Design a protein around this ligand. Structure first.
Ligand SMILES: CCCCCCCCCCCCCCCCCC(=O)OC[C@H](COP(=O)(O)OCCN)OC(=O)CCCCCCCCCCCCC
Ligand SMILES: [Fe+2]
Length: 658
């Protein structure tokens, strides 16, 4: 049939190459608000938007993440580019090589040939990419006619990664049988350098410092009157803080800070959770009190209650050096808090509030803002690889016996339900950096001076905020241009109606639009960076932090031992999974905030509007201001106890893609 014949030749590779070239042409259109476009442009963009809703499709019944608004599938165009692919394949092949090299010869035979070939094929692909990038340079006028070999390279790396997958499954099918004090926790690294946290994780001031400069800087809050369920009294406080101090004066001088994990819900099973693959696991919803001394030199831990009900969880107080009989009970209570922390951090702060929020903004943007809408142009780079990585999360990390089931004590269907619930309850406006710092009363550096996430995050937040304002003003001259924009209004409708983004509301003016975009951009870029890139240095070593414990919380502050603490350490399989997935997820830096060039070949500018790209213009100013931020952070880091480098703009990707 004449009507069918084109289908034969029209494969996926051809279609990716077709979309890539279409991409670059549609790139030429000067962007416009729909009300300022001409009749022809209005008709074409309504047609494209209809076609966009074919390809970008909402579901709330995606595998393993029921309830969460997701893409039904990742469009061909949204598959990662060669550059991301090579990078990520590179890390996983390194980790495979490291692992096989750590096995006895007998057992290595399973994998050693497959691994050698994966490593050699990656090397052949990298060399291809290099030579392709050399011919473009030698003849840049012919550059556009090399894109097809870049798409061909893309097909080759995808196939590499499918083979990489088959090996990882075979290794991890066998790991429980392959795995062999804290000796086992160092052995899992193989040749990987152990993080610095492995040498100081027992230090009490280091433990407090997690609250302000660790992977979860969001939960800590000021407390003015302690709640009934945390019955710490003045004698206990004064025992830690000195007789010249008191709860009452500490409260009043804004020196008390509470860490309360009540919101974990089923992520903190009420008791033992026995699993075949990992044995008996526990996790917790503790409450910990921290305080500043009068000089506010630094936060100190004061007391830890290992669950919500004091009638069933005793109060653990910071011991003195001399108090050997309290030493181990206290190390157990800290471990409890860190078990809560991995759960809170990874499920809520990382997965629910970055990844899964950006999912919804991605889908709404592609479905309702035309490709030539200025806000599409602005936002699209900040979603690159987001749909792909999150489908990765759902499929690969969240099923039975997957990484999350292995690494987090809860039953996997409780984990999935609690993660998704936190996403659905997450309020877009309350979740804004300035709003979070106000609501928790941690916004004033004279009360809480050392808080690197706050002070470094405000630099980045405010830099993005000026950029958004500068950019909106190019296109929207008044509030009426905002309310007359039918695309922006449809986007709002979908963010609420399909995206289920709590707290989202009509946008009725420019200042509010700026705040909205600032949130969307910051969430995709800096917030993600801040909570994802700690994983390799802070969360790869299981005795410092793990989302499951093999023993219950300590039953008494007194009389515990080293043996009793060691009981809490997880099985070896958990530690093996931990080091590998956390190295991986924090080792791919793809794209950079403010660059706004394509991150794949031909690496073209994002913005063609000469008003945006003008010398001294909005984009240049944002790029200049990020470099000023870098320099200020680097200066701050000279005076800090440890550098906090996650919010250096040079380390912040534009998008959430790992
Ligand atoms: C822990 C808590 C995390 C919470 C935050 C989570 C948010 C986002 C992170 C999602 C990460 C998703 C996995 C890592 C990214 C995958 C990289 C890649 O593209 O590889 C894909 C590859 C092929 O994918 P498939 O064809 O299998 O598609 C199957 C769908 N079922 O499939 C594969 O090769 C499988 C990849 C396995 C990599 C894991 C590291 C193992 C290193 C091996 C050492 C032994
Ligand atoms: Fe991430």
């Amino acid at each position: 049939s004449i009507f069918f014949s084109p289908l034969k030749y029209l494969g996926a590779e051809q279609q990716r190459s077709i979309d890539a070239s279409r991409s670059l042409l549609d790139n030429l259109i000067p962007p416009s608000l729909p009300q300022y476009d001409n009749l022809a442009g209005k008709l074409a963009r309504r047609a494209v938007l209809t076609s966009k809703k074919l390809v970008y499709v909402w579901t709330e019944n995606f595998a393993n993440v029921k309830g969460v608004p997701m893409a039904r599938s990742v469009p061909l165009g949204e598959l990662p580019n060669v550059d991301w692919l090579l990078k990520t394949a590179g890390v996983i092949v390194e980790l495979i090589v490291n692992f096989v090299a750590s096995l006895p010869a007998s057992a290595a035979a399973q994998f050693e040939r497959i691994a050698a070939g994966l490593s050699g094929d990656l090397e052949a692909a990298r060399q291809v990419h290099e030579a392709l990038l050399e011919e473009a340079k030698n003849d840049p006028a012919a550059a556009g006619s090399l894109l097809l070999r870049f798409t061909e390279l893309q097909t080759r790396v995808i196939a590499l990664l499918t083979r990489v997958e088959l090996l990882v499954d075979d290794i991890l099918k066998s790991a429980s049988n392959l795995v062999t004090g804290l000796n086992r926790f160092r052995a899992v690294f193989g040749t990987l350098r152990l993080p610095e946290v492995a040498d100081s994780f027992r230090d009490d001031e280091a433990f407090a410092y997690w609250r302000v400069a660790g992977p979860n800087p969001l939960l800590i809050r000021r407390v003015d009157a302690l709640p009934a369920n945390f019955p710490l009294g003045e004698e206990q406080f004064r025992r830690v803080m000195g007789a010249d101090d008191s709860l009452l004066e500490a409260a009043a001088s804004r020196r008390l800070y509470l860490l309360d994990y009540a919101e974990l819900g089923k992520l903190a099973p009420s008791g033992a959770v026995d699993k075949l693959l990992t044995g008996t696991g526990f996790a917790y919803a503790p409450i910990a009190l921290f305080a500043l001394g009068k000089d506010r030199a630094g936060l100190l831990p004061v007391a830890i209650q290992c669950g919500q009900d004091p009638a069933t969880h005793p109060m653990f107080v910071r011991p003195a050096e001399s108090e050997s009989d309290l030493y181990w009970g206290w190390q157990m209570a800290k471990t409890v808090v860190q078990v809560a922390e991995e759960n809170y951090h990874e499920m809520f702060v990382h997965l629910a509030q970055t990844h899964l929020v950006s999912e919804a903004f991605c889908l709404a943007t592609q479905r309702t803002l035309a490709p030539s809408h200025p806000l599409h142009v602005l936002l699209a780079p900040h979603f690159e690889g987001t749909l792909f990585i999150n489908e990765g999360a759902a499929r690969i990390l969240l099923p039975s016996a997957g990484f999350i089931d292995v690494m987090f004590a809860a039953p996997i269907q409780d984990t999935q339900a609690t993660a998704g619930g936190n996403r659905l309850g997450f309020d877009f406006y309350r979740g804004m950096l300035p709003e979070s710092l106000k609501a928790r009363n941690v916004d004033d550096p004279a009360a809480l001076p050392d808080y690197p996430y706050r002070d470094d995050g405000l630099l980045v937040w405010n830099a993005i905020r000026q950029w958004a304002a500068d950019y909106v003003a190019v296109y929207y001259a008044s509030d009426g241009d905002v309310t007359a924009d039918v695309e922006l209004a449809a986007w709002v409708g979908e963010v609420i109606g399909s995206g289920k983004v709590a707290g989202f509301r009509p946008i009725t003016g420019r200042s509010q639009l700026v705040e909205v975009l600032t949130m969307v951009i910051f969430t995709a870029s800096a917030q993600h960076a801040a909570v994802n890139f700690p994983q390799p240095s802070m969360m790869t070593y299981a005795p410092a932090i793990c989302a499951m414990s093999a023993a219950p919380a300590p039953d008494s502050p007194s009389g515990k031992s080293e043996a009793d603490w060691l009981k809490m350490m997880p099985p070896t399989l958990v530690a093996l999974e931990k080091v590998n997935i956390y190295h991986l997820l924090g080792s791919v830096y793809h794209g950079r905030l403010g660059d706004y060039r394509q991150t794949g070949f031909p690496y073209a500018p994002v913005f063609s509007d000469r008003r945006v790209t003008a010398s001294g213009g909005p984009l240049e100013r944002f790029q200049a201001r990020l470099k000023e931020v870098e320099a200020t952070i680097r200066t701050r880091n000279q005076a800090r106890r440890k550098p906090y480098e996650y919010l250096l703009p040079s380390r912040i990707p534009a998008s959430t893609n790992i």
